[PDB]
């Protein structure tokens, strides 16, 4: 348990030892880390973390890098962290469907600072090889009373009033500009215009909404007089 | 419905004109009539089958149903003074003191002597 | 007719061929019998000897004569005793060629008929015959013994005596055997009857009007007795020629015997506390008489042609709609058709004019009720086309256990002591006449008390049996009767319980009334004075009325029927007896009790504080309706547990703390073709009608208070809002709109979602149309058929209480749970309908533990007593579950399967449900029946079953709040006021069901939770405490492959293979609940 | 190394998306020449398990 410093696979494993609570009589909880490999704008100069703690966020990234850092002398900023859906309640986007899990993503500022934590958490990964003592406590911050009744709190009025108000706003523009676009007499590039039924409303919706005689031929009454005599 | 009471219903429908109407009469084809009918008798029985008789009679007050009835026909015929007309009772289930208790809302003596 | 008669004729031959018998034993038997008539030959005969002789001679023999009571005296016997050679017969279902293969044994009956030159035609008075016959078989017994120490069978014989169904004035002798002629194996027993000729005696001077014994009332056990013994063997001839005269006599005679025997009903003497009168031997004559004849015509309702489905649907359906008792009676000739008459001789009265014999005076009035009310609902359910009730009818033993026999039950000890100590320990009196009209002490008591208990109590129950505990019917051949000294008597029994079938409709009547008044007192109302005593008094009504009455108090932990009883055994029966119902009494000390005045003196039948609720919520109604909108409003129907009457505790006001505090109510707008086609826009529109109408009800109606709370119960929608109002009726609502939009729009986005997003999304429709469309129905049809069965709503509040106790209601659903409490009353086959709440509640554990969900379904006729199911509807919902078992044959995605008119699917309630919750409830509901089976009906009992295992757990985390929520929460041991901050409503809430619903959430892929939601009543004496349960599913228990979608928190046991981290799992629990976790146990 | 019917439904209640356990369970029905019943468990496996993993898919 001692040598597990890495994995074959590419990830390298991160622990974490927690405090000596009052009815246990130290763990140390493992995450894990790859460079991230992708071609969109937003998701480049990232890090892949798999088996975070408890409500991960942006200050205890900081904590972490800011450990990280000061031990090794590497500098790494922080810019922003993706994915954070551990509870199991954002994976369908049902809005634009009528209209990746306990892992998350973390952006930096620039390949310096992802290179710097690359090569600090490569030496933390060697303190887990040799020194399992070196290595960085984790602290949630403790979901309490005051946390769970925060969610238990009632709503504001005037959040709610602007919410609406904006979101029936810019729906209301959105819908207009889009009956606008599929009733304002489409024709191709050669002549070719569009049918429009009244009161439709989207060309995505257009896009988704997309008797014989035996008796009569003197071939057909000799073929029926042949099958009956 | 739902509390076994075989009912009957009857409901009624003039024949409006528009606002913009300059024909004197506004009739309605026959084919809108029966179509109409048929809109009509299908809510009239989808929502007194889904309904229970209290529950009927509390829909049946404020007027919701005849409500109903021209926000569905809106689009065959503009019509006017639609109106549940007549309600007529024709079986009653087994009899429930406790039921009776219940939707209207245990006493001793005065020791004579 | 011709499906059921397949399937009902192939399931009768199963059953036959399944419980036929043993010819190898039948031949061993015969071989047997022929040889006791060999030994009966070798027998010698006895002389004319008088008292004296007879005792010197059984005096230094060591038999002694088991002489009936009273017992010969000298002073009275002129008259002798002898003994010669009797005639040999043959009885039984043996005789009748219909025997089976009983498994506890079966025995057959053979009869030593007297000789005439031995009678006198004055030996029918006073006991002369009766003693006859017990000296008779002393001599018969004593040479059968000699003749046995003769033959040296007695290594393996055993020979006891017995009475004849339990008749103390006949006894008869018993013969059974142990471990050439050892026919233990057969589980055989034979007995030896003593009988007198045909006609020996005149039957129409021991007709049971007549009297016998001078000493006037008649003796009608002592004619019966005399007459059968005179008469046993005509009526085997008449059953072995109508037998030959029909084609399936010993099938119906075997379909009778099985059904009987699995009623508890046998031709045991009834009139002493026990259940019988009706078995095998008065079926058979029943046959023969409706193949004689019966009608009132007298015309032949029962045809010889008939099958055997066919015979036994017409007993059954005569005896359903036939009295034997009270306005009717049956009339037949053995030697002259049966013939119905109106005249009932107030007893069961089945009348061979050719005997001059009533056949069913073993029977009691109550045996007989008990009796035509099951065949009224096995006639029931033999018209069931529907559904078939084979299995049901026979394949089921309901005499297992008489709190599930009976609603009621009561235990009274009766020290009672001697037959002088009679005079000053019963109230009643025993003189000379009471003798003779019970010549048995124990059938006067027992037609005592069950007079005395059937006045008191009258229309507030439907039927009433006694048992008394204690009976025995063997005794050693040394011995003259049968001697038992224990239970503060010198009589067969210890004690004695009485069991009782309500009426639920006349249980809570606070008032007994009786007869009315005048001045001239009418003896009616005198001796309902005269019965009622003290208690009774004069009192009038608002209508104007002077009547006798007598009034109770209600109580929450006794009912008026256990009051009566008390006074009524204490008053007219005895100043000693000892009246309990110490089970009753726990199980509404349990059932929790609302923090309300007078809830002391609430019974369980006062749905008051969900009438206050209704009518709040009314208010509330007409406000919304007088409310004007850019819309109508077109509906409002509540939804709440509480409306349907059957959330775990009563309402109370103010009383926020409560989990079914703001009930749901369903609101929905008119048809407005302009909603949004978007759902997060038409969401948002519905936000904004509930915000219009906060503002207009702050506007207006400022006594109310209001806010919105956050919802996103139903996945993937992250905006649902539910407008919660309090009202100074001290009660809260949410408000929800309802849409044919958003079923719509969640149909479009089933249709436009990928091939492997369909079933999270069907779920996720399934979740919403539970939540929304099923529900209404549900609690309206659940209203409706609650009001037609009282019960049920203590039984499911009960329930409800079970399973929190138990811990499984953070996986099983309010409605899964009603529709398994309602499952025993809209099916209360074989049993009656529960009018108890311990009958009701054990009626469903039963039915729990007795399922199967692998292979059983369960479809429930919502329905009124007597729109039920039809065949195309019944048929449509076997192939839905047929084809869901054979997409699901074992129940990883589905364990139980319920269905209704509501649900045609059967899926909406049982969803999202582990196997191993599925497996946990099964089990407990197993080891709930094994320690009642075991270790007895106690309050002992009833806090083993009510107590949590707590084992089986991997882990345990104890933990409490820190307020205390019982009182606050309104259960007894309170709030009167809203506060002012509803952010300090929120606070004062209650947090832990949100963690476990979250914890779940999270580690859903790897853990499994329980916890106990209802704190109020499960949290101990604060009502704080509370406990997490949690198990580890067994693949994340092993150890895996480390992938990017593995989806735990692990630990690597090598450089590719992880396995969890377990320690790792439990400091994140401690995390989350920091300010909470008291305790931490693990595996 | 689930033998039996009911160890296999218990290891699928380990993880009902792990197509390993769901190989194992048909691969056992092939073995004992149950061609129906694995063919349907593998419509069963279609049926349960999650849509994140296409590579299991």
């Known amino acids: 348990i001692e040598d597990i410093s890495a994995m074959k696979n590419g990830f390298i494993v991160v622990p974490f030892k927690l405090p000596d609570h009052k009815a246990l009589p130290a763990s140390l909880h493992f995450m894990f880390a790859k460079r991230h490999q992708s071609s969109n704008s937003n998701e480049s100069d990232c890090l892949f973390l798999v088996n975070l703690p408890l409500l991960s966020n942006i200050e205890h990234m900081k904590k972490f890098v800011g450990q990280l850092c000061g031990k090794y002398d590497t500098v790494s900023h922080v810019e922003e962290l993706l994915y954070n859906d551990e509870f199991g309640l954002h994976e369908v986007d049902l809005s634009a469907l009528t209209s990746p899990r306990n892992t998350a993503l973390l952006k930096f500022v620039d390949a310096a600072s992802i290179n710097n934590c690359w090569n600090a958490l490569k030496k933390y990964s060697n303190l887990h090889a040799k020194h399992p003592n070196e290595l960085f406590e984790w602290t949630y911050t403790t979901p309490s009373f005051t946390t769970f009744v925060n969610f238990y709190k009632p709503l504001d009025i005037d959040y709610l009033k602007e919410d609406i108000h904006t979101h029936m706003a810019i729906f209301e523009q959105r819908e207009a500009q889009a009956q606008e676009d599929v009733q304002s007499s489409i024709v191709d590039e050669d002549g070719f215009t569009l049918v429009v039924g009244k009161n439709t409303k989207s060309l995505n919706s257009i896009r988704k909404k997309i008797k014989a005689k035996k008796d009569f031929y003197r071939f057909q009454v000799r073929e029926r007089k042949k099958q009956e005599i | ?113 | 007719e011709l499906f059921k008669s397949n399937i009902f004729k192939l399931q009768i031959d199963e059953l036959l061929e399944q419980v036929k018998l043993k010819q190898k034993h039948v031949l061993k038997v015969e071989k047997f019998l022929h040889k006791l008539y060999d030994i009966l030959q070798e027998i010698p005969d006895w002389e004319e000897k008088s008292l004296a002789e007879v005792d010197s001679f059984f005096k230094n023999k060591i038999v002694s004569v088991p002489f009936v009571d009273p017992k010969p005296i000298p002073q009275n016997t002129n008259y002798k005793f002898n003994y010669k050679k009797p005639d040999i017969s043959l009885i039984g279902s043996f005789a009748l060629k219909a025997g089976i293969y009983q498994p506890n044994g079966s025995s057959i009956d053979t009869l030593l008929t007297m000789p005439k030159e031995l009678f006198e035609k004055k030996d029918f008075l006073n006991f002369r015959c009766l003693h006859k016959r017990s000296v008779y078989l002393a001599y018969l017994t004593h040479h059968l013994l000699i003749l046995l120490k003769k033959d040296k069978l007695d290594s393996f014989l055993q020979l006891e005596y017995s009475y004849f169904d339990n008749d103390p004035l006949l006894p008869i002798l018993r013969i059974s055997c142990s471990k050439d002629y050892n026919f233990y194996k057969t589980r055989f027993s034979i007995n030896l009857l003593i009988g007198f000729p045909y006609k020996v005696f005149e039957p129409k001077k021991l007709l049971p009007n007549r009297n016998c014994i001078r000493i006037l009332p008649a003796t009608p056990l002592y004619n019966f007795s005399v007459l059968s013994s005179s008469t046993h063997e005509n009526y085997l001839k008449y059953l072995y020629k109508t037998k030959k005269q029909t084609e399936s006599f010993v099938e119906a005679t075997v379909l009778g015997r099985l059904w009987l025997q699995q009623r508890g009903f046998s031709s045991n003497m009834s009139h002493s506390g026990s259940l019988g009168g009706f078995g095998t031997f008065e079926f058979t004559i029943l046959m023969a008489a409706l193949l004689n004849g019966g009608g009132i015509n007298s015309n032949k309702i029962l045809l010889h042609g008939f099958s055997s489905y066919q015979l036994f649907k017409g007993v059954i359906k005569y005896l359903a709609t036939m009295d034997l008792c009270h306005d009717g009676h049956l009339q037949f000739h053995s030697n002259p058709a049966s013939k119905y008459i109106d005249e009932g001789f107030q007893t069961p009265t089945l009348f061979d004019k050719s005997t001059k014999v009533n056949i069913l005076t073993k029977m009691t009035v109550s045996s007989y009720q008990i009796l035509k009310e099951y065949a009224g609902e096995t006639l029931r359910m033999l018209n069931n086309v529907v559904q078939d009730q084979f299995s049901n009818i026979f394949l089921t033993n309901i005499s297992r256990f008489d709190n599930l026999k009976y609603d009621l039950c009561y235990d009274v000890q009766l020290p009672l002591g001697k037959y002088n100590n009679l005079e000053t320990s019963l109230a009643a009196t025993f003189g000379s006449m009471e003798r003779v009209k019970f010549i048995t002490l124990e059938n006067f008591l027992a037609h005592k008390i069950t007079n005395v208990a059937r006045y008191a109590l009258g229309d507030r129950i439907k039927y009433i049996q006694i048992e008394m505990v204690g009976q025995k019917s063997d005794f050693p051949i040394t011995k003259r009767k049968v001697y038992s000294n224990t239970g503060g008597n010198h009589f067969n029994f210890d004690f004695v319980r009485v069991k009782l079938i309500v009426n639920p409709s006349e249980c809570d009547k606070l008032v007994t009334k009786g007869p009315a008044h005048s001045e001239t007192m009418s003896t009616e109302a005198a001796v309902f004075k005269n019965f009622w005593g003290i208690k009774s008094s004069l009192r009038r009504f608002k209508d104007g009325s002077i009547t006798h009455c007598c009034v109770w108090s209600t109580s929450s932990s006794e009912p008026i029927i256990s009051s009566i009883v008390n006074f009524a055994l204490q008053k007219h029966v005895s100043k000693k007896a000892q009246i309990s119902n110490e089970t009753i009494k726990k199980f509404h000390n349990f059932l929790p009790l609302p923090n309300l005045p007078s809830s002391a003196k609430t019974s369980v039948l006062n749905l008051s504080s969900f009438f206050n609720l209704k009518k709040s919520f009314d208010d509330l109604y007409k406000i919304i309706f007088q409310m004007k909108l850019p819309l109508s409003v077109k509906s409002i129907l509540p939804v709440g547990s509480a409306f349907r009457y059957t959330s775990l505790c009563q309402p109370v006001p103010f009383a926020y703390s409560d989990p079914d505090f703001f009930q749901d109510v369903i609101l929905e707008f008119e048809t407005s073709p302009k909603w949004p086609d978007e759902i997060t826009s038409l969401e948002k529109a519905k936000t904004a009608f509930l915000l219009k109408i906060q503002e207009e009800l702050s506007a207006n109606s400022s006594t109310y208070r209001s806010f919105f709370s956050r919802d996103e119960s139903i996945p993937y929608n992250l905006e649902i809002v539910t407008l919660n109002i309090l009202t100074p009726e001290g009660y809260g609502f949410k408000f929800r709109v309802l849409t044919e939009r958003d079923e719509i729009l969640y149909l479009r986005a089933i249709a436009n979602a990928r091939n492997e997003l369909k079933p999270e999304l069907e779920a996720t429709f399934l979740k919403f149309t539970a939540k929304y469309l099923a529900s209404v129905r549900h609690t309206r049809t659940l209203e409706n058929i609650s009001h037609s069965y009282q019960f049920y709503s203590p039984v499911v509040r009960l329930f409800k209480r079970w399973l929190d106790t138990h811990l499984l209601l953070g996986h099983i659903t309010d409605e899964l749970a009603e529709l398994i409490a309602i499952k025993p009353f809209v099916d209360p086959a074989p049993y009656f309908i529960p009018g108890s709440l311990e009958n009701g509640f054990l009626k469903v554990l039963k039915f729990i533990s007795q399922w199967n969900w692998k292979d059983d379904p369960l479809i429930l006729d919502l329905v009124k007593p007597e729109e039920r199911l039809t065949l195309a509807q019944y048929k449509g919902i076997q192939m839905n579950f047929t084809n869901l078992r054979n997409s699901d044959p074992n129940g990883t995605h589905l364990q139980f399967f319920v269905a209704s008119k509501n649900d045609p699917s059967g899926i909406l309630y049982s969803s999202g449900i582990p196997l191993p919750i599925a497996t946990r409830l099964t089990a407990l509901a197993k080891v709930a029946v094994n320690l009642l089976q075991t270790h007895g009906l106690n309050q002992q009992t009833i806090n083993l079953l009510f107590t949590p295992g707590l084992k089986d757990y991997d882990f345990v985390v104890d933990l409490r709040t820190p307020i205390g929520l019982k009182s606050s929460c309104g259960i007894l041991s309170a709030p009167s006021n809203f506060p002012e901050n509803l952010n300090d409503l929120s606070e004062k809430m209650d947090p832990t069901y949100q963690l476990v619903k979250y914890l779940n959430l999270k580690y859903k892929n790897s853990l499994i939770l329980s916890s106990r939601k209802y704190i109020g009543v499960n949290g101990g004496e604060k009502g704080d405490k509370n406990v997490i349960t949690g198990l580890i599913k067994p693949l994340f228990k092993g150890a895996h492959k480390f992938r990017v979608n593995l989806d735990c928190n692990v630990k690597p046991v090598d450089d590719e293979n992880v396995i969890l981290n377990k320690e790792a799992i439990f400091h994140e629990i401690a995390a989350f609940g920091n300010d909470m976790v008291i305790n931490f146990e693990t595996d | 190394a689930p033998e039996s019917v009911a160890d296999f439904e218990r290891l699928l209640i380990g993880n009902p998306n792990s197509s390993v356990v769901w190989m194992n369970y048909m691969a056992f029905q092939l073995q004992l020449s149950e061609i129906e019943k694995a063919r349907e468990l593998a419509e069963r496996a279609l049926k349960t398990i999650n849509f994140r993993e296409e590579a299991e898919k």
Do not use: C, W
């Open chain 2, 1 to 113: 419905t739902s509390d076994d009471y075989v009912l009957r219903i009857f409901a009624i429908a003039f024949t409006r004109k528009q606002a913009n109407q300059v024909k004197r009469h506004s009739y309605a084809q026959s084919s809108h009539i029966r179509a109409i009918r048929k809109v009509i008798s299908e809510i009239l029985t989808k929502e007194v089958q889904g309904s229970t008789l209290a529950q009927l009679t509390s829909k049946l007050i404020p007027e919701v149903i005849n409500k109903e009835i021209e926000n569905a026909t809106k689009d065959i015929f503009p019509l006017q003074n639609i109106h549940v007309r007549k309600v007529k009772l024709l079986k009653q289930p087994k009899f429930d003191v406790g039921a009776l208790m219940a939707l209207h809302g245990e006493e001793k003596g005065k020791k004579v002597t």
